[PDB]
Design a binder for this molecule. Structure first.
Ligand code: ZN
Length: 192
């Protein structure tokens, strides 16, 4: 099981999210109280990277999903049969991978040779104009409810900052629910 231990590191690495609210039309919304993102399948999911100092050239940013519950933590998070056989390929992402990155031609996908885990990595770039952070647009390609997949089992997304040689620079994580109505689901899970 990959580490989900938070680690800000030398560069003061922390995660952020748009303050999107919970309207019916929201694609992606983050709950600070739950540390949990609610998002629609295949829709854009802004995840912000915040640093106290800019990492060196050649830095990469990796994302991986693992199951939250200890009794599923060794099971590899992957797309359901129905979705992995869907005709939604972009030509880059393997069909079995839950998490894609949209709008980045330098995206890299990895099936771990030993753990069999899936992950997706992009070059870290410095903050764009108008932002104090760097935004990556993720897409989750399976619903949490999906049969033969997650089957309503909650997952975390682990975001690691690593240098060009593989060394760990930083790590954070947030819970995800991929669902039809993110705004409503967020309100409900906070209502408890
Ligand atoms: Zn699915």
């Amino acid at each position: 099981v990959p580490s989900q231990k938070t680690y800000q590191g030398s560069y003061g690495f922390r995660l952020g999210f748009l303050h999107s609210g919970t309207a019916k039309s929201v694609t992606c919304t983050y709950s600070p109280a739950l540390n949990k993102m609610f998002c629609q399948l295949a829709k854009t999911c802004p995840v912000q990277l915040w640093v106290d100092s800019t990492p060196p050239p050649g830095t990469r940013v990796r994302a991986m999903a693992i199951y939250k519950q200890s009794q599923h933590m060794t099971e590899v998070v992957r797309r359901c049969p129905h979705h992995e056989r869907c005709s939604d390929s972009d030509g880059l992402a393997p069909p079995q991978h839950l998490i894609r990155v949209e709008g980045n031609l330098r995206v890299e996908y990895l099936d771990d040779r030993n753990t069999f885990r899936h992950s997706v990595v992009v070059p870290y770039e410095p903050p764009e104009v108008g932002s104090d952070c760097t935004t990556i647009h993720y897409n989750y390609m399976c619903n949490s409810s999906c049969m033969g997949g997650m089957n309503r089992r909650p997952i975390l997304t682990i975001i690691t900052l690593e240098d060009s040689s593989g060394n760990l620079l930083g790590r954070n994580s947030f819970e995800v629910c991929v669902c039809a109505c993110p705004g409503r689901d967020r309100r409900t899970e906070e209502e408890n």
